[PDB]
Amino acid sequence: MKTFTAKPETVKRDWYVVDATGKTLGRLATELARRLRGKHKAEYTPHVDTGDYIIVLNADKVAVTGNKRTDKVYYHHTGHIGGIKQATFEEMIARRPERVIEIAVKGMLPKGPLGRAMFRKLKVYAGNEHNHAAQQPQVLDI
Amino acid sequence: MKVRASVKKLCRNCKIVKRDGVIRVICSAEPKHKQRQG
Amino acid sequence: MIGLVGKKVGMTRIFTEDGVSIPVTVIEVEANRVTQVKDLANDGYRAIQVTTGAKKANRVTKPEAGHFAKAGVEAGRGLWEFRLAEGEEFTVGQSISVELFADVKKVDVTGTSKGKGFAGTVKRWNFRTQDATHGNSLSHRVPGSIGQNQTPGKVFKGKKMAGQMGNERVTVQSLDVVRVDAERNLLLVKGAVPGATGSDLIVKPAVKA
Amino acid sequence: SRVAKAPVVVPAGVDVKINGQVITIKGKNGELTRTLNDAVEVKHADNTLTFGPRDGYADGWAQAGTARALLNSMVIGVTEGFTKKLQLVGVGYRAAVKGNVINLSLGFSHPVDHQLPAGITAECPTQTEIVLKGADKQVIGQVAADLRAYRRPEPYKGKGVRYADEVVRTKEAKKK
RNA sequence: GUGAAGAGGGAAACAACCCAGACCGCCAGCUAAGGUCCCAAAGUCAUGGUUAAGUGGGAAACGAUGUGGGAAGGCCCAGAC
RNA sequence: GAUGUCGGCUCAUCACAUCCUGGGGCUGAAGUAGGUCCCAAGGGUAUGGCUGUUCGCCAUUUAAAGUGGUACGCGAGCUGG
RNA sequence: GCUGAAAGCAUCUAAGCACGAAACUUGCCCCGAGAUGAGUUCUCCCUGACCCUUUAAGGGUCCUGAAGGAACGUUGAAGAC
Ligand SMILES: [Mg+2]
Ligand SMILES: [Mg+2]
Ligand SMILES: [Mg+2]
Ligand SMILES: [Mg+2]
Ligand SMILES: [Mg+2]
Ligand SMILES: [Mg+2]
Ligand SMILES: [Mg+2]
Ligand SMILES: [Mg+2]
Ligand SMILES: [Mg+2]
Ligand SMILES: [Mg+2]
Ligand SMILES: [Mg+2]
Ligand SMILES: [Mg+2]
Ligand SMILES: [Mg+2]
Ligand SMILES: [Mg+2]
Ligand SMILES: [Mg+2]
Ligand SMILES: [Mg+2]
Ligand SMILES: [Mg+2]
Ligand SMILES: [Mg+2]
Ligand SMILES: [Zn+2]
C-alpha cells in the first residue's frame, strides 16, 4: 500500500498556550516551529500543515544569553538605496516585542507558501492576556 | 591620549587597566602617558 | 490645541501705519460643527470630527445624513478630524469658531497644492537643462543619465523622474496670524498658503512656535 | 577578599533588616537601602554584619568585598555624615544656596543653578566654598562631581571648582 | 590523482577538493565522507573539562594584573607584600 | 559571429582613510589661532583665466572648495574638443 | 566621572550609578490597511413566494431591485488617457 498522506480537510489542529517568560529565545522558537510544522505528529506530511495553533504570552520577557540583549542586531532593508536599517534586541523588545519571536520562528520554518501558512497559526502577545479563550487552548511548557 | 597597538607603562606611576575590553594606561603624574589600545 | 477648517478666499495686503505691506491669505473660517467625539475607549484615540459649510440635502447620501443627524448638526461639505491634547474637551453639536485663533500668534496651514499635471524633471526637481546649442541632439530638457553601469545595474528607488506634480497635501508651517475677524468669520494669515482660491484649508496652531 | 572577610560592625542605634538581597539600614541621618548581587549571603549573627559568597557564582568573593564596602559606607552614612567640600577659585567666582539649589557664578554668560537630590544639603561659609552633607557616599561624590564639571580646575592658574582635597598641578605657558 | 570522457552523496551554492565509479527496476535494509536544535534526514546524547570573546563564524609583528593548567623558586610569625 | 575607448555636460549613488560643521583627549594648549590623535558619513562641500584636457598653475571666492568606489559611474542620456 | 571590590591600596567596572555629539530612535512634513497580519469607528440599506435533487456554504423559477454606485450630460485654478 501507498504510505499515508495527511489531508488538510481532515487534519486536526489543537490550540496551545505558551508562556515566554524567562525562556531562551532560540530554544523556545525551535519548539514552536516544530509544533507549527507538525513534526511532533506521526501524521506529519511535509506538504501539509499538520501543525497546531500556538499562543505565546509574555513575548516582552523572552530571555537571551550573553550580551545579546544589547548586541544582537536585527537588520532590514527598505528597498531604497542607503535604506539599511538597524535595531538591537532591546530596542525591538521596547518598540515591537512580538516581532522578536515572530522573526525567529519565521526563520526556522520552511520558506514558501506552506511555511507562510504555518506561521499564521502562531499568535504572539507581549502580555499575559490573549483574546482567544473561545478556542480552549491548553497549557504547554517549553 | 595616544592610541596605539602597543600600550605600555612609561613611568612607575602608570597603571594598566581594562575598562570595556580595552587596555588603557592611566598615569597620576603625566597626562602625556594616557594610552588606549587601538 | 485643535485646529479649524476653512476655505481659501484669496490673497490681499494689510497696510500698517508704519508703512509696511503685509501679504495675507484670507481664510474663510465658518463655524466648525462637531459631528463625532472619538474617545480612547470605543475608538482607541482622542479626536473630534468636524464639518463646516453646507451641502445639498439632495446631494447628501443617507449614510452621511444619519451621521449628521446623530450629531444634531447640519450637513456640511466634508468631515475633518483633529486630535485632542488631553485637556481640551468637546461635545457633539458644539460649534467652534475662528475665535479659537484669537490668542495664537502663528499657525500651520495645510491644503492641496495647485496641480501641475505631468511635470518634467526641470520643473518638478530643479534639474538643470543641458546646452541649448553646441551640438545637443534632442536632449535639451531631458533628465540625462539615470544611473551607473553594471554594478547596481538598475535604477535606484526614489530616483527623481518626471511625473505628477502638485495636487497633493502640503503644509506650510509657522505662518503669522495677521488678524482674527470673528464677526465676519475670517482668519488673516501672513503669506501664501497651499492651493487654489476656493479650496479647503485646515488651520492649526503651530507645533514648533 | 580581606575586604569581605573583615566583618561589618554596627554601633548602637542602627536597626538593620535583611530581606534576602534587598537590605536597608536605619539611622539618625536616615534610611539607606541596597539590593546586593545574588552571589552575596549577608547575615545577622552578632551586633555585626558578615559577608561571604553564595556557592554557584564565580564572581563570589569580589561581590562580597563590594557589599562590605557598601554597607560600611551605609552604616557610617546613617550614623555619621559624609561631607565633601568644594573650593572655588576665580576672581569673580562665587556660590550661594537657596534651599535645595546652588546658584553658581563661574564666569559664564548664563547663571549656573544646580539642583540637589533628596538627601543632600549644601551650605557656604564663604562665597567660594560649597559644603555638601548626606548619608549616601555615592550621591555626594556624584553631586560634587557635577558641580566640579561646570568649571573643572584648569591647569595654568587653577581656576574653577576644586575639591578642597584636590591638589592641582600648575604648568607654565609656552615660552615667548 | 581527479576532471576532461564521471553521474550519485558531502564541501551553502562550487569541472579539477573529500567520499564514492550509475546495466534496469523496488514506497526494503547497512554504511562512506560528512553530519544529527529549526529551515533539513538523524543525539537539544552521556561523562569530564575549556571559552564569555557570539571568540567559535576572516587577518600578522607587537601589546596587556583576561582566564585555565603545569614545573619549580625567592620573601614569610628573628613579622614579609 | 564587437563589452564604444580620454575629458566635458546631465543625473547621480555608496564607502570613510572627515575638507567644513558637531563631540572629545594629549599639547612644546595663556588667550586668539594652531598642532596631533580618537568618535562621527546627518547635511553641506566654488566661479573663472590658460589648455581637448584629467590634472596643474594663476585670479578671486567659501564654513569648507574632502578622499576614493560605482565598466578610471553615466555616449540605446547629450557632446565629440 | 561617582561609588566600588576582585587585588587590605589603587582602580570609571566586575555588581551598581551618572554625564556625554549634526550619527542612531523619536520629535517636523508627506505617502500609508494589497499591513492577504487586508485593522478600527460612525452611519445607511435589504425582514418575499417557492420548485428541484448526488441534501449542500447546492441549482433553478416567480416576485422584488434597496442603500448606493456607475453610466450619460454640463464641466473644473483636477487632468496625457
Ligand atoms: Mg529548501
Ligand atoms: Mg492643474
Ligand atoms: Mg534642438
Ligand atoms: Mg543584481
Ligand atoms: Mg575535449
Ligand atoms: Mg548540493
Ligand atoms: Mg544507519
Ligand atoms: Mg562524525
Ligand atoms: Mg530533523
Ligand atoms: Mg545535553
Ligand atoms: Mg567571528
Ligand atoms: Mg571613522
Ligand atoms: Mg537624526
Ligand atoms: Mg580652473
Ligand atoms: Mg564619487
Ligand atoms: Mg568611465
Ligand atoms: Mg550606456
Ligand atoms: Mg575630435
Ligand atoms: Zn606614567
What residue spans define the domains of chain D?
8-80, 86-162
Sign of the Cα torsion A89, A94, A99, A101 reads positive
**Residue B17 annotated as binding site:** no
**Residue A65, phi then psi, degrees to nearest 5:** -95, 165
Query: How many angstroms separate the CA atoms of D93 and D111, rounded?
Result: 11
> If you measure from the C-alpha of residue C163 to the centroid of ligand 15, how many angstroms do you get, rounded to a whole number?
28
Interatomic CA distance for residues A5 and A47, integer angstroms: 9
DSSP, residue by residue, chain A:
-PPP---TTT----EEEEE-TT-BHHHHHHHHHHHHHTTTSTT--TTS----EEEEE-GGG-B--TTHHHH-EEEEE-SSTT-EEEEEHHHHHHH-HHHHHHHHHHHHSPSSHHHHHHHHTEEE-SSS--S-GGG-PEE---
Amino acid letter, C45: Y
Helix/strand/coil percent split, chain B, to 5: 10, 40, 50
Strands (E), D27-97: 32-35, 40-44, 48-53, 85-89, 94-97
Closest CA to A17 of A93, A106, A128: A128
How far is residue B8's CA from residue B33's CA, in Å, rounded to a whole number? Answer: 9
C133 touches strand F (CB under 7 A): no
Residue C39 per-residue DSSP state: -
Side chain identity at D45, as an amino acid letter? Answer: A
A15-19 vs A138-139, strand pairing mode: parallel
For C142, the domain range is 1-209
CA–CA gap between residue D152 and residue D87 (Å, rounded): 11
Helix (H, G, I), strand (E, B) or coil at C193: coil
**Chain A residues touching residue C157 (CB < 8 angstroms):** 79-81
Residues less than 5 Å from ion ligand 19, measured at CB: B 10-11, 13-14, 27, 30, 33
Grid cell locating C16 = 500698517
Locate breaks in chain A with C to N over 2.5 A; list the residue preceding each.
none
Q: Which domain holds residue A113?
A: 1-142
Query: Measured between CB atoms, does A1 come within 8 Å of chain C?
Result: no
Look up the CATH number of domain D86-162: 3.90.930.12
CB spacing of C152 vs A80 below 8 angstroms: no
CA separation for the pair A83, A66 (Å, rounded): 29
- The CATH code that applies to domain D8-80 is 3.90.930.12
Quick one: cell of B36? 588606549
Residue ranges of alpha helices (H) inside chain D are 2-5, 61-79, 137-150
Q: Is C44 exposed, middle or buried (0-12, 13-18, 19+ CB in 10 A)?
A: exposed
Nine cell digits for residue A113: 507558501
For residues D70 and D47, give the distance between their C-alpha atoms in angstroms, rounded to a whole number: 17
Quote the cell numbers at residue C20: 509696511
Instruction: Tell which A residues from 78 to 137 touch C, by Cβ distance under 8 Å.
Output: 79-81
Domain count, chain C: 1
Beta bridge partners of D121: D133
On the 0-12 / 13-18 / 19+ scale of CB atoms within 10 A, D151 is buried
**Cell 506521526, residue located:** A42
Residues in CB range of C132: below 8 A, 6 or more apart: C140
Element (H, E) at D131: strand D129-134
DSSP C111-143: EEPPP-EEE-HHHHH-PPP--SSTT--S-SSS-
CA D38 to chain CA mean position, Å:
24
Select from A136, A5, A129, A141 the least CA-distant residue to A58: A129
Query: Of all nucleotides in the shown strands, which has a C1' nearest the CA of C130?
Result: F10
Quote the minimal CA–CA distance from A49 to chain C in Å.
36
How many separate domains does chain A show?
1
How many whole angstroms separate alpha carbon C193 and alpha carbon C190?
A: 9
Shortest Cα–Cα distance, C161 to chain A (Å)? 15
Q: C6 near C28, Cβ under 8 Å?
A: yes
